[PDB]
Amino acid sequence: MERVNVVGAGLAGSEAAWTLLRLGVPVRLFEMRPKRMTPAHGTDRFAEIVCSNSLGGEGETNAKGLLQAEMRRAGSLVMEAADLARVPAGGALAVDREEFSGYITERLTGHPLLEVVREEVREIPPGITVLATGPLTSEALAEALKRRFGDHFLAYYDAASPIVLYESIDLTKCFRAGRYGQSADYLNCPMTEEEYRRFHQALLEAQCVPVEELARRGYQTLLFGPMKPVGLVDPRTGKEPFAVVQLRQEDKAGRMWSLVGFQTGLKWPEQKRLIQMIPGLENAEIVRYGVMHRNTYLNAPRLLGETLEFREAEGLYAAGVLAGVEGYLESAATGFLAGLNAARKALGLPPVAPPEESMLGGLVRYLATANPEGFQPMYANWGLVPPVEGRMGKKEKRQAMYRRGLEAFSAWLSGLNPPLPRP
Ligand SMILES: Cc1cc2nc3c(=O)[nH]c(=O)nc-3n(C[C@H](O)[C@H](O)[C@H](O)COP(=O)(O)OP(=O)(O)OC[C@H]3O[C@@H](n4cnc5c(N)ncnc54)[C@H](O)[C@@H]3O)c2cc1C
């Protein structure tokens, strides 16, 4: 019909291309490597794994585990490669990285419907196009995306604060409120002077400014910063608290709230330790840890639909880190969806999206509808899907969520018209 462009042959680009091919749609796959390398890549292989060889935990209480199962059910090339290249790593799905990318490279390159172009794409290609250029998207394409969609809707670094599950918050210790300049819908966690003092020092021991760097500059620094109580009034004392930690709603459904101004580079167990010191958050469940690093991505809530098609550019898609996710598997899975919808478009069919119970479904809903102001990248986590009701233990609830999501995803796949062929 029409040959579809896929820009970038990483995790997301490789899966997109494959999905197009599986549906008999011809692909033009651009990859600048090796003509131009990124600071993190060392080969010219498709889907090169640049760091850890882990695709995440595979257990039935792990959100990444559910996403693995969905992609396996979908006949994903990345999962096929991963299962073949698997090496023992207790708990996690880990791979021999060269075998993995070699297998993926061979399968794609040897497909007759696939044409590979070894060039840096400097402008958005016309026609039906999937952009999947990753955290180290070439500067020229990044600037082309800004020119086309707006210079505040692409970032070159993230600065993400920890996000906690709302249902894990002890709300008796908080209050909704804003100060002048703020929306009245922040959650506030008040601290006494002694509570702040101990918090500040634990932060020293834990080691757009990273929050720990502010502590390091002194006791007063945080208080002048993101923990300033000015303009707030505790309705439990009728007074302005000594200090506060504010939380803001991140997802449309309200299951996920971030700590305001808590961008951080602390190790994950240190973040957990620190957050559980905050009144209201003592047994809060962190579902997305804070990070700050070089990372090119689009503001998905301002730009994309749940289908991963650009809302204001028909037949254009983003996948992977560029689309606002984080993680090898998350990149591949959004690659799959974007490739599926791009293929459908080429075939004159309307777009689809997985259900909200599935991890991929929960993930793309979040990309499309999360809080757009200061949007940060998201990885798979249980905050993304509806909870299971009950008084049974956490592990049992999560197992149920896993089973319900994989079942919803499988039914969705089965309903596909046209269907994806068996692997
Ligand atoms: C240093 C580092 C460490 C990471 N560690 C982990 C980790 O431990 N675990 C984890 O889950 N994830 C990790 N990631 C995060 C992320 O999940 C991976 O980067 C993942 O590969 C993202 O998939 P992707 O397809 O979106 O991007 P990529 O896999 O990077 O694919 C993008 C491709 O597009 C190409 N490209 C870029 N610009 C152009 C252009 N203009 N024209 C043509 N081609 C272009 C690139 O050469 C690249 O091949 C890490 C990332 C980095 C940078």
Q: How far apart, in Å, are the Cα atoms of 186 and each of 183, 189, 261? A: 7, 10, 13
Specify the experimental method. Answer: X-ray
Same domain, yes or no, for 12 and 160? no
Tokens of 142: 């990044």
The single-letter DSSP state of residue 382 is G
Pocket probe mutation, ligand 1, options 38, 121, 154, max atoms within 8 Å of Cβ: 38
Kindly state the helix (H) or strand (E) to which residue 344 belongs, with its residue range.
Answer: helix 328-346
Q: Identify the burial level of 13 via C-beta atoms within 10 angstroms of its C-beta, where 0-12 means exposed, 13-18 middle and 19 or more buried.
A: buried
User: Could you give the CA distance from residue 38 to residue 209 in angstroms, rounded to a whole number?
Assistant: 26
Same domain, yes or no, for 64 and 93? yes
Pocket probe mutation, ligand 1, options 11, 108, 156, max atoms within 8 Å of Cβ: 11
Handedness of CA 77, 81, 83, 87 (dihedral sign): negative
Q: How far apart, in Å, are the Cα atoms of 388 and each of 65, 397, 412? A: 17, 6, 20
Which residue, of 295, 324, 341, is where some domain finishes? Answer: 295
Pocket probe mutation, ligand 1, options 321, 322, 325, max atoms within 8 Å of Cβ: 321
Query: Domain count of the chain?
Result: 2
Same domain, yes or no, for 413 and 376? yes
Q: What is the resolution of this structure in A?
A: 2.1
- On whether 253 is known to bind a ligand per the annotation, the reply is no
- On whether 9 is known to bind a ligand per the annotation, the reply is yes
- On whether 93 is known to bind a ligand per the annotation, the reply is no
Of ligand 1's listed atoms, the one at least distance from the Cα of 36 is 47
Same domain, yes or no, for 89 and 197? no
Cis geometry, peptide bond prior to residue 162 (ω within 30 degrees of 0): no
Q: How many CB atoms lie within 10 A of CB 173?
A: 16
User: Could you give the CA distance from residue 396 to residue 79 in angstroms, rounded to a whole number?
Assistant: 26
Range of the domain at 177: 156-295
Kindly state the helix (H) or strand (E) to which residue 203 belongs, with its residue range.
Answer: helix 193-206
User: Could you give the CA distance from residue 118 to residue 35 in angstroms, rounded to a whole number?
Assistant: 7
**If you take atom 10 of ligand 1, which residue's CA is the nearest one?**
327
Please report, for the chain, how many H helices and E strands are present, in that order.
13, 16
Q: Tell me the CA–centroid distance for residue 66 and ligand 1, in Å.
A: 22
Same domain, yes or no, for 138 and 82? yes
Same domain, yes or no, for 246 and 225? yes
**If you take atom 15 of ligand 1, which residue's CA is the nearest one?**
327
Q: Pairing mode, if any, of strands 129-131 and 4-7?
A: parallel
Of ligand 1's listed atoms, the one at least distance from the Cα of 295 is 53
- Ligand 1 first shell, C-beta below 6 A: 7-13, 30-33, 38, 40-41, 50-52, 120-121, 132-138, 141, 320-322, 326-328, 331
Same domain, yes or no, for 1 and 131? yes
Kindly state the helix (H) or strand (E) to which residue 195 belongs, with its residue range.
Answer: helix 193-206
Same domain, yes or no, for 325 and 405? yes
CATH code of the domain covering residue 387:
3.50.50.60
Same domain, yes or no, for 204 and 322? no
Q: Identify the burial level of 422 via C-beta atoms within 10 angstroms of its C-beta, where 0-12 means exposed, 13-18 middle and 19 or more buried.
A: exposed
What value, to the nearest 5°, has the Cα angle with vertex 107 and ends 79 and 122? 95
**If you take atom 8 of ligand 1, which residue's CA is the nearest one?**
52
Q: Pairing mode, if any, of strands 187-191 and 54-57?
A: unpaired
Of ligand 1's listed atoms, the one at least distance from the Cα of 321 is 26
Same domain, yes or no, for 104 and 38? yes
Q: How far apart, in Å, are the Cα atoms of 3 and each of 127, 147, 310? A: 9, 25, 19
- On whether 8 is known to bind a ligand per the annotation, the reply is yes
Which residue, of 275, 295, 315, is where some domain finishes? Answer: 295
Q: Tell me the CA–centroid distance for residue 255 and ligand 1, in Å.
A: 29
- On whether 368 is known to bind a ligand per the annotation, the reply is no
Tokens of 215: 């502590």
The single-letter DSSP state of residue 388 is P
Which residue, of 246, 264, 295, is where some domain finishes? Answer: 295
**If you take atom 4 of ligand 1, which residue's CA is the nearest one?**
51
Q: Tell me the CA–centroid distance for residue 134 and ligand 1, in Å.
A: 4
Tell me how far the alpha carbon of residue 215 is from its chain's centroid: 28
Kindly state the helix (H) or strand (E) to which residue 215 belongs, with its residue range.
Answer: helix 211-216
CB crowding 373-396: b at 16 or more within 10 Å, else e: ebbbbbbbbbbbbeebeeeeeeee
Same domain, yes or no, for 266 and 210? yes
Handedness of CA 332, 336, 342, 346 (dihedral sign): positive
Q: How many CB atoms lie within 10 A of CB 215?
A: 22
Same domain, yes or no, for 39 and 151? yes
- On whether 348 is known to bind a ligand per the annotation, the reply is no
